[PDB]
Structures are given as structure tokens and as C-alpha cells.
Nucleic acid binder design. Structure first.
Ligand code: NA
Ligand code: NA
Ligand code: NA
Ligand code: NA
Length: 1043
RNA sequence: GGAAAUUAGGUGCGCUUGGCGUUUUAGUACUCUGGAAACAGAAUCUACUAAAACAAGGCAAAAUGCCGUGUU
DNA sequence: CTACCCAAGCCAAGCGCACCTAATTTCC
DNA sequence: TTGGGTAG
């Protein structure tokens, strides 16, 4: 039939509501669910990618230093340098002789940790933060008379350690020390100047941001030109043309001419500047003064400033005129007419200055110009600052209309329109459905991008199954992400705690239990300092408590135009003032005779109220002092745009995409958005359950409410004015009072259909991506007990943190797990003493150090033992793991990584018994065009699971795939335990965590299913994006993945 | 609403580095044994320093070498 | 099996371009 | 939230 589509677009969900356009009965409703596309995910990938390069290039630096030492025959395979201490050698080499083994180990150590380059220049007063800027400053002061190696050696002898936060130095300080060392060791070893040059180079050299990665990288570029051209944007009017450099000469001339052509001069002659005038202006004030002032242009044209209007202006109110940057930058170093009067050359100098990023490359590229530039000039030009960014137009666009700017008075947009040049757009005439490719182009957040792409796919599926709707109404989340969302929640709860405490304070003080029924009026009362804002008369709290009906909550701006139901549009006033005011603004009401006070007296009170701590809302101030005319349509448009509709950038982009698609394919579909604040008002007034603990269906419930709102706006003729604005159609009945407003929207008994609806559908996005995180980073050592079991060795760090009770619980439950319990028991007894004395304290080690200022030290008869900074203890028995012991030679024990991230599991039915094979991310291998499962790993896993050749493959299960275990349908999380045949699932219509909360069940909030001989049946289900269920069938395990 | 410009603020993608962190091994300290000491042996607990590995792995051949946790 | 338990790499410094917001001038 | 070992 004819239907209205409502969309609730969220961070992790897209809820849709389908309701009849006439009957207002719900056809269908559901939720599309997916993971939040938060920026930290890709940040993690980029961060790891950067870390790999750092480690790779650091290693490559060392190898080259060693390869250099090999070539000069200071190092051999046979040469042994193990006992040597670099800090001792590096200091000794500064004034004495070193062995070929002792000298090289000093050079190698320097090459490994070479310090920073960029931080160097600027000192920072020490706020005692562990900042690089602060630390570098602190070391420089302490490096005044000493070299780096010297200072480190002193710290080593004096403090016992070198490494840490302090070990941050400038690269120059290392190089300075290296140079001195090489100068002294120069006499004792046969080295040429090529040696000392190559090493210093190797020590200090690092890639630049514009140089990028090496030759192979898909992230790299061939040269600086290709690098910049890829990044820079394209012209608005010529898409094929690259933008001009922001400060090209012709670009700024274009800017200056637009300024002059926008001017209006009041005089007997023409009000617009003639060509000869603009020529004189450009030459006599623009090419003469760096920052042209209004006076200079006025003096040139022989009028006063007051006669000149229509000029760009700064926030101070001072005129802003285009600065000819290149012209003056070059003029200052050279006044030769050969250079300055050459626009083309000035253009080329600007481009070179902007594209390339260092003086040296600038010089070379400037030299390649074969201009009339003196080399002395070129070197001077290369140090010019501020050549960054692009103009929004190409030189092609700029040069084309430059004469027109000179000889007409039309600005750029007037000329472009006259020339029939339209800003580039994307055609959707060919598209069979609403495209998803365009989303990134107009989006800022990764979170919003995914939500939009999913939203579009939801729409495309709905129109395919249901046909086109007349109306699409959309609401977006207030939060940009979940972290931001949680912050909103915290502030909400905190405010609630404050108000709830305030109410308790009143019932204890007055004994009037009525206060819990007057929260909003009390909130207003406290916020308004106990005065009626319209009469400025005092509102005694006792009278408010006893007779609350005498004091009315009035809406500042009438909701007939404001559509604002929030606390910001509410004021507690006397019933008499609220009655007299009617459908007016405070300004309109207080201007009339009906009012007790003048608007000025009112304005004064509000302004003082709006300043200071606990002040009135800023939005409230803007409302209370609204002096525009409410009946003016333009003003009504502003309020609708602020409070009734969603005019945020992301919303506009998506909405325009939909409208553009429909208009081009000539589809009569009306698209609109709605402010979340207004829908919340509806849900509140339509008496929906306050506590949203029903699970995912709330998203579909919201979309139905959103769809119902669209229905209401198309039902009434008084809402036709507002409906028109929401649908953005070009251009009367209207809501006249507060009471009328309530009648139209507060209709709780007309939406029972929504609440009674119980046919919600759910769609969970399935993840099948290969090569995600393969395994946890942490390296673990192992031990073998007397029983023969290999045990994981864990570390206890942060023993002196306040809230760290890990050690206390460990000793009370299992002291024998401490390796220190078996070896060095003297220290254990020393620890146990500390533990027993502060048993009540969460961390006995914290309170100790807090009181003594000293840490637990290893036992020594001389009381000179070392501090204990972390304690090893035995963990669980080793099982599922990654053996990487081979990376560590002659290691007495196994070295492992843990948590083998599963890709999927394949269920087999083997002789009436269900079993499954766990496919790890480690088992999926990449090829140039595709991923494939390791057959040797799969068969091995098949054998370890005792799967037989007779067994038949049932299905594969990825994350969020639907599974029916013994007749109950769940969604797959993943393999929880391969060895114990335990897979983890969750509920489809709700989280299992919340399900237990509703039941007040204290069981662990995780569903673990065991696939064993007691398992009766396993089926694989799936859904469309709308949440419609269906069963699947397959014959063999997919071993090839395309990516 | 759209076009250009000026200032301030913000978001993302990409690049370039720093010092940590985990682990092994070696040396030293610490503990234990013998000894007048030197020193040797044991232990590998705690600490410091150096060398090496750090998503499994895949390329690549003197290289400011390259890829491997994102999206679809 | 149920009902537990544990533990999971991290900060700081540059840079390019794209995009957005707010304010100001003109015009379409 | 999730790999996965543990007590009973
Ligand atoms: Na480009
Ligand atoms: Na620049
Ligand atoms: Na009055
Ligand atoms: Na940025």
C-alpha cells in the first residue's frame, strides 16, 4: 500500500519503521545492527604499520653501520664484543684509544638510539610533565660542558640506570659526540673522510614527510610533484584541472580584483570602479603597500572612506583587502622589472615554493626555471615562509576570467554564471539504486560513514521489497561516537543525582513530600533565583510547594513556531503572567500594556542572570531576549531549522543525496529529517516506557515514532507550512495557541498500534574479513613443573599502585605461584611481612611506600639489595599458543604468544555426533589477489578433532552468523575453546548481559555452547539486511577468500 | 542553499621520527657454597647494561629497500 | 557441563593535503 | 568484549 518510512540512524544501529500513509497502521519494523566504525580501529592499523617501519629501518641502519665496519675491516665474524660496555667505551673514545672491537661497539650503540631532530629548537619551562619538549630542555642544560655519553655514564654510575624517560636527547647532541669521538679515533685507525661522512650521515639521516616510504610501497610516490598533485584538490569549475597554488600571483590578483568589483562608491560618477581606476589602485596601493588600507584606496580614487562600502571586513571592524603575497615577497629581495613585472614567472615561483618543502629543493627547482633570476636571489627566495595550501580554483579558471574582472564590474560568480560554467556535480540518472560510493566524499567521521552506507542499503532493500514511499523521515544520533555518547550519559546521570539530592534536601527541610512531584518547577525555581521572570516578583518556595498550580511553566517562544519542548524553552512564572502573555514572546508581551514591567527592566535582570556560575542557559538567554517578529515567515523558518529539523552537515549531505537521486530519476518521494529533541518529546508525551530495557527493538520502535511524526505533519493543514519547510519545497493556516499545539502532537491514545506491535525483525552484520588481528602481542616465558606440565609465566607490575590488589589476593590464595616463593625465599618472607602489616589496605605495598617513601628491596645482609619493580608468578597450564621459541636462540624455556584469534568454525556431522574445526586467522594465508586456508593446517586440525573422512560438512560459521543449537537460535561470537569444543554466542533481539539484568540474574553474562555428543541439532540461518530469516545449504568448506 | 576570498577552530587520510614496553641470552650485582684473599662453583629469584626477536609470516637483494591488525 | 577465573602494548613530536564549523563582503 | 583456562 502507500507507506511512510521512518529511519532511526545510530552509531551501531539503523532502525526502520514502515507505516501506512492513510491507515497509520504499522506494516513492518526492524533493526539493522553492526559494529561501530570508530576511528581507533584504523588508527591501530596505521599505528602498527608505522611501528613496523621504525623497527625495520632501525635494524637496517645498524646493518649498514656493521656493513661499513666490515668493509673497512674493523669488524669480522670472528670479532667478539660481548663484555664491552658502550658507555664506558663511548666516554673513553672521546679522549683515548679504543680496540677495533671496543670502538665499533661504541659506534653501533650510537646508531641504535639517535634521538630527535624536530623538537630540538624550542625550549620549554619544566612543568615537571614527562614531556619530550621538557626533557630535551632539561638535558641540554645538563649537557653544557659534557657530551651525551659522558652524562649517561655518570647517571649509570650515580643512579644505576640509563634507560627511561630521561634518555631522550637531540640527534645533534649525538652527532656532536660522534664527531668528537671520530676525531680522536681518527689517528689510531686507517679511515678516510668518506668513512666519517658516511657514518655521520647514517647516524643522523631520516626520511622526510614528503619523501615517504621506499620504492615498493603502495603508500609511496615517485617524486615530490606526484606526491603533491595526488593530495591537492581540483577546480570547482574545471574538475579535470588541478587547483592553483593558493598564493600564485594571478590567484591573488584575482582575489584583489574581486574585492574592487564588489565595492560601491557613492559619487557623482559611476558607483562601480572603472578599469583605469582599478589599474591605478592595483599599481599605486596594492603593488605599493603590503596590506592595503581603506584610506589608501580612497586617497587614490579621490573620495572619502565613508563613500566606500561593500568591502570585506575583519572581526575588529577593520577593512580587509587582498595581499599580493608573491609580489611583495619577491619585491623585498629584488625590484628588477625583469622579475616583478613578469606575472608568469611570479606564478611559477609561487608554485615551486608551495609544492616543494625545503630550501635546497626550492633552489634546484628555481634554478631549473632558466629565468633571469640571480642565484643570490634564488637562495633568498628559498627561505620565504607561508607558501602553503591551494586556491580553490585552477589557474585555468582564474586566467580565463581575469580580463573580465579587469574590464567589467562583475565578480567571479557573476562571470562564471554568465559564462554558463556550473560547479561540478554527480549525475545519478544511470544509477539503478541509491549509490553508496558517494558517502565518503561528503562525510567526516568513519562512524557516520558506516551508519550512512548501512542506512542507504536499508532504504534500497525496503523499496525493492515494498516499493517507493511518498515520505521518508530520518533522525540521526546526537553522538558522533560511543565514547561521546557515554560522556552525555554520565553528565545526564550526574545532573539527575544533583536534582535528586536537592529534592531530598527539601523534603527533609520542609517535610513536604510534594516536592518529588514538582521537580521541573523546582528546577526552574532554583535556576531563576526564586523569581517570576515576567513580573520579577518573588516566588516563595513554600508557596510553590503548597500551591504549585498558582505558578505556571510557560514556554518562552511559543511552540507553534519554536517547536522547542526542552528545558531551555521553559520558565516558571505566575499563572497571571502566563495568562496575559498568550502566544507572544517576552519581548512582545512586555512591550504591551498588559505587562507589569518594562522590557528594559526585564532585559537587565536576564543579562545578570545569564552571567556567572550556575547561570541561565545561553539558549535560554537567546530565547528570552528574542526581539524579532514571530509572525514573520523568515523567522519561523529559522526556528524550524534549529529545533524541528536536523541541519547538521552530515544530515544535509545524506538528505541531499536522497533528494538528488529521486528528482533525477523523476520519483515522487518526499524526504525530510527531524530533530532528535522533538522525537524525544513525542515518546515522552505518548507515554512509552521510560526504561528502555527491551533490547534492540527500541531502535525500530523509535523509527515508528519518527514515521508517526511524519504522518502527523501531513495530516493537518495548520502543519502544512511547517511540513513544506521540512520537505524544503518552494513557496496560510497555522497553530495559533499553546493549547492547540498540545492537541495536535500529544496524542497517546492514537499510537497504541506501535506499542502492540510484536513482529520486529533483526539483522546482524556478518564479519568475514581475513587478516584481522592474528594474535595478542604480549610475549610469555614458560616453566616446567615437577609434574611435567609447561606453565605460563606471568608478570605483576604496578605493585605500588593504590587500587592494585593483585598481589594481596595472590599471596592469600596461592603464595606458591610466586617464583620468589621457591627461589630467594628470604625476599618472600620480607615481602610477606609487608603484606601482613597492611592487610586491610587494598595494596600493602602502596601504603608502605606512601608512608616510608621506600620500596620493597631484595634481601641483602648489607641492606644494599636492589628494588623490586615486578614479580614473576606461575600462570595457567600452557595449551593453545604460538611457539616462537626459535626466534630466541639457546633459550632454556619455550617462548609463546597467546590468544589465537579465530576466523570461523566449520561444523561436521560425524557418525551422529557434531564436531567442528576451528579456522584461525593464522591459518588464512594471503596471495596477491586472494586469501586461502592452509590445507595442511585444516587437515591437521581435522585429525586433532578426530573428524573422519566419512563425516559430512554441515556449515561454516563466522562472527554474527545465525546458529540454531538444539532448536534455539543465537548469533555467533566465535570459538571460545577449540580443545573443549566451546563456542560463544549471544542473543539476537537483545544482549545477553541486559537479558540477565532484566531477570536480575547474577550468572556470568556470557553464553557458552558446547558442541559434543549431547548436541542434538545444528542449523545455519541468515538474514537479509532487513532482518528476514532464511535457512542455508552448502556442500563443501570455502577455502578461497577474495581480497 | 550555492560561488570566491580573510581569520580562528575542528575532523580525517597519509607520511616521518622519538623514548618506553614484553622476551631470550650474556655479563654484573644480589642470594648460596668454599676460601685468608684472589677466585671458582651453584642458583636464574630480583635488578641494571648490552646484543637480538616482537602481530604468524611474505618479498627483496648494498637499498634514506618493501608488505602484513582499516574500509568495502 | 555450570559457574567461575584471568588478562589483553604505550605515550610524546613533526608534516602534507582533503573536508567541516563560526564570523565578514559581494552575487546567484 | 573476548580467547581460554579452572574448580567442581
Ligand atoms: Na589530486
Ligand atoms: Na609550505
Ligand atoms: Na510593560
Ligand atoms: Na589535521
Amino acid at each position: 500500500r502507500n507507506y511512510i518510512l521512518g529511519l532511526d540512524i545510530g552509531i551501531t544501529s539503523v532502525g526502520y519503521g514502515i507505516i501506512d500513509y492513510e491507515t497509520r497502521d504499522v506494516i513492518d519494523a526492524g533493526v539493522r545492527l553492526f559494529k561501530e566504525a570508530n576511528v581507533e580501529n584504523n588508527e591501530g592499523r596505521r599505528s602498527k604499520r608505522g611501528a613496523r617501519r621504525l623497527k625495520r629501518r632501525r635494524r637496517h641502519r645498524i646493518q649498514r653501520v656493521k656493513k661499513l665496519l666490515f668493509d673497512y675491516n674493523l669488524l669480522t665474524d670472528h670479532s667478539e664484543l660481548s663484555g664491552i660496555n658502550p658507555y664506558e667505551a663511548r666516554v673513553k673514545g672521546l679522549s683515548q684509544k679504543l680496540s677495533e672491537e671496543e670502538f665499533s661497539a661504541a659506534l653501533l650503540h650510537l646508531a641504535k638510539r639517535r634521538g630527535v631532530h624536530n623538537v630540538n629548537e624550542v625550549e620549554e619551562d619544566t612543568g615537571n610533565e614527562l614531556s619530550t619538549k621538557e626533557q630535551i630542555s632539561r638535558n641540554s642544560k645538563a649537557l653544557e660542558e659534557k657530551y651525551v655519553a659522558e652524562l649517561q655514564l655518570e647517571r649509570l654510575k650515580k643512579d644505576g640506570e640509563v634507560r627511561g624517560s630521561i634518555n631522550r636527547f637531540k640527534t645533534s647532541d649525538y652527532v656532536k659526540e660522534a664527531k668528537q669521538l671520530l676525531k680522536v679515533q681518527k689517528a689510531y685507525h686507517q679511515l678516510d673522510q668518506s668513512f666519517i661522512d658516511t657514518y655521520i650521515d647514517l647516524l643522523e639521516t631520516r626520511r622526510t614527510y614528503y619523501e615517504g616510504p621506499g620504492e615498493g610501497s603502495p603508500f609511496g610516490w615517485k617524486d615530490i610533484k606526484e606526491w603533491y598533485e595526488m593530495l591537492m584538490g581540483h577546480c570547482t569549475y574545471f574538475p579535470e584541472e588541478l587547483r592553483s597554488v593558493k598564493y600564485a600571483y594571478n590567484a591573488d590578483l584575482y582575489n584583489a580584483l574581486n574585492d574592487l568589483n564588489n565595492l560601491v562608491i557613492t559619487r557623482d560618477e559611476n558607483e562601480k570602479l572603472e578599469y583605469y581606476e582599478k589599474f591605478q589602485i592595483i599599481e599605486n596601493v596594492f603593488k605599493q603597500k603590503k596590506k592595503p588600507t581603506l584610506k589608501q584606496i580612497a586617497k587614490e580614487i579621490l573620495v572619502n572612506e565613508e563613500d566606500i562600502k561593500g568591502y570585506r571586513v575583519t572581526s575588529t571592524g577593520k577593512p580587509e583587502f587582498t595581499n599580493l603575497k608573491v609580489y611583495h615577497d619577491i619585491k623585498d629581495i629584488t625590484a628588477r622589472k625583469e622579475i616583478i613585472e613578469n606575472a608568469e614567472l611570479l606564478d611559477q615561483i609561487a608554485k615551486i615554493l608551495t609544492i616543494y618543502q625545503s630550501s635546497e629543493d626550492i633552489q634546484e627547482e628555481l634554478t631549473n626555471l632558466n629565468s633571469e633570476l640571480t642565484q643570490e636571489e634564488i637562495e633568498q627566495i628559498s627561505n620565504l615562509k607561508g607558501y602553503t595550501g591551494t586556491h580553490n580554483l585552477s589557474l585555468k579558471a582564474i586566467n580565463l576570467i581575469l580580463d573580465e574582472l579587469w574590464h567589467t564590474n562583475d565578480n567571479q560568480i557573476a562571470i562564471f554564471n554568465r559564462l554558463k560554467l556550473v560547479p561540478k556535480k554527480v549525475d545519478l540518472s544511470q544509477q539503478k539504486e541509491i549509490p553508496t560510493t558517494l558517502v565518503d566524499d561528503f562525510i567526516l567521521s568513519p562512524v557516520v560513514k558506516r551508519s550512512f552506507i548501512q542506512s542507504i542499503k536499508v532504504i534500497n532493500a525496503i523499496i525493492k521489497k515494498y516499493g517507493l514511499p511518498n515520505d521518508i523521515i530520518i533522525e540521526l544520533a546526537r553522538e558522533k561516537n560511543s565514547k561521546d555518547a557515554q560522556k552525555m550519559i554520565n553528565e545526564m546521570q550526574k545532573r539527575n543525582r544533583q536534582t535528586n539530592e536537592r529534592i531530598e534536601e527539601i523534603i527533609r527541610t520542609t517535610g513536604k513530600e510534594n516536592a518529588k512531584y514538582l521537580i521541573e518547577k523546582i528546577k526552574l525555581h532554583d535556576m531563576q533565583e526564586g523569581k517570576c521572570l515576567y513580573s520579577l516578583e518573588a516566588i516563595p518556595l513554600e508557596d510553590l510547594l503548597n500551591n504549585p498550580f498558582n505558578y505556571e511553566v510557560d514556554h518562552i517562544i511559543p511552540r507553534s513556531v519554536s517547536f522547542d519542548n526542552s528545558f531551555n524553552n521553559k520558565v516558571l512564572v505566575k499563572q497571571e503572567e502566563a495568562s496575559k502573555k498568550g502566544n507572544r514572546t517576552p519581548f512582545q508581551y512586555l512591550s504591551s500594556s498588559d505587562s507589569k514591567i518594562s522590557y528594559e527592566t526585564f532585559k537587565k535582570h536576564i543579562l545578570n542572570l545569564a552571567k556567572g556560575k550556575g547561570r541561565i542557559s545561553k539558549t535560554k538567554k537567546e530565547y528570552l531576549l528574542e526581539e524579532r517578529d514571530i509572525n514573520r515567515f523568515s523567522v519561523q523558518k529559522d526556528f524550524i531549522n534549529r529545533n524541528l529539523v536536523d541541519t547538521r552537515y552530515a544530515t544535509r549531505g545524506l538528505m541531499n543525496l536522497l533528494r538528488s537521486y529521486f528528482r533525477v530519476n523523476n520519483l515522487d518521494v518526499k524526504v525530510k529529517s527531524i530533530n532528535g529533541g522533538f522525537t524525544s518529546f513525542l515518546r515522552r508525551k505518548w507515554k512509552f516506557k521510560k526504561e528502555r530495557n527491551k533490547g534492540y527493538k527500541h531502535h525500530a520502535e523509535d523509527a515508528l515514532i519518527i514515521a508517526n511524526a511524519d504522518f502527523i505533519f501531513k495530516e493537518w493543514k495548520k502543519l502544512d507550512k511547517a511540513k513544506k519547510v521540512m520537505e524544503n519545497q518552494m513557496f496560510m493556516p497555522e497553530i495559533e495557541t499553546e493549547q492547540e499545539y498540545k492537541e495536535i502532537f500529544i496524542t497517546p491514545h492514537q499510537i497504541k498500534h506501535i506499542k502492540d506491535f510484536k513482529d520486529y525483525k533483526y539483522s546482524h552484520r556478518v564479519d568475514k574479513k581475513p587478516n584481522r588481528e592474528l594474535i595478542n602481542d604480549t610475549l610469555y616465558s614458560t616453566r616446567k613443573d615437577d609434574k611435567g606440565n609447561t606453565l605460563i609465566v606471568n608478570n605483576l607490575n604496578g605493585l605500588y599502585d593504590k587500587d592494585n590488589d593483585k598481589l594481596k589476593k595472590l599471596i592469600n590464595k596461592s603464595p606458591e605461584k610466586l617464583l620468589m616463593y621457591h627461589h630467594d625465599p628470604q625476599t618472600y618472607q620480607k615481602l610477606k611481612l609487608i603484606m601482613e602489616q597492611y592487610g586491610d589496605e587494598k595494596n600493602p605495598l602502596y601504603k608502605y611506600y606512601e608512608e616510608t617513601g621506600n620500596y620493597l628491596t631484595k634481601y641483602s645482609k648489607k641492606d644494599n639489595g636492589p628494588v623490586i619493580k615486578k614479580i614473576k608468578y606461575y600462570g595457567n597450564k600452557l595449551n593453545a599458543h604460538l611457539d616462537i621459541t626459535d626466534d630466541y636462540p639457546n633459550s632454556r624455556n619455550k617462548v609463546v604468544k597467546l590468544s589465537l584469534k579465530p576466523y570461523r568454525f566449520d561444523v561436521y556431522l560425524d557418525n551422529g555426533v557434531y564436531k567442528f574445526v576451528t579456522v584461525k586467522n593464522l591459518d588464512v594465508i594471503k596471495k596477491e589477489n586472494y586469501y586461502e586456508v592452509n590445507s595442511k593446517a585444516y587437515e591437521e586440525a581435522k585429525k586433532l578433532k578426530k573428524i573422519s573422512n566419512q563425516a559430512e560438512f554441515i556449515a561454516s560459521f563466522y562472527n554474527n552468523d545465525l546458529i540454531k543449537i538444539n532448536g534455539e537460535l543465537y548469533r555467533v561470537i566465535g570459538v571460545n575453546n577449540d580443545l573443549l569444543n566451546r563456542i560463544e554466542v549471544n542473543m539476537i533481539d537483545i544482549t545477553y548481559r541486559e537479558y540477565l539484568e532484566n531477570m536480575n540474574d547474577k550468572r556470568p553474562p556470557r553464553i557458552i555452547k558446547t558442541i559434543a555428543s549431547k548436541t542434538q541439532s545444528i542449523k545455519k540461518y541468515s538474514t537479509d539486511i532487513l532482518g528476514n530469516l532464511y535457512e542455508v545449504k552448502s556442500k563443501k568448506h570455502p577455502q578461497i577468500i577474495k581480497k
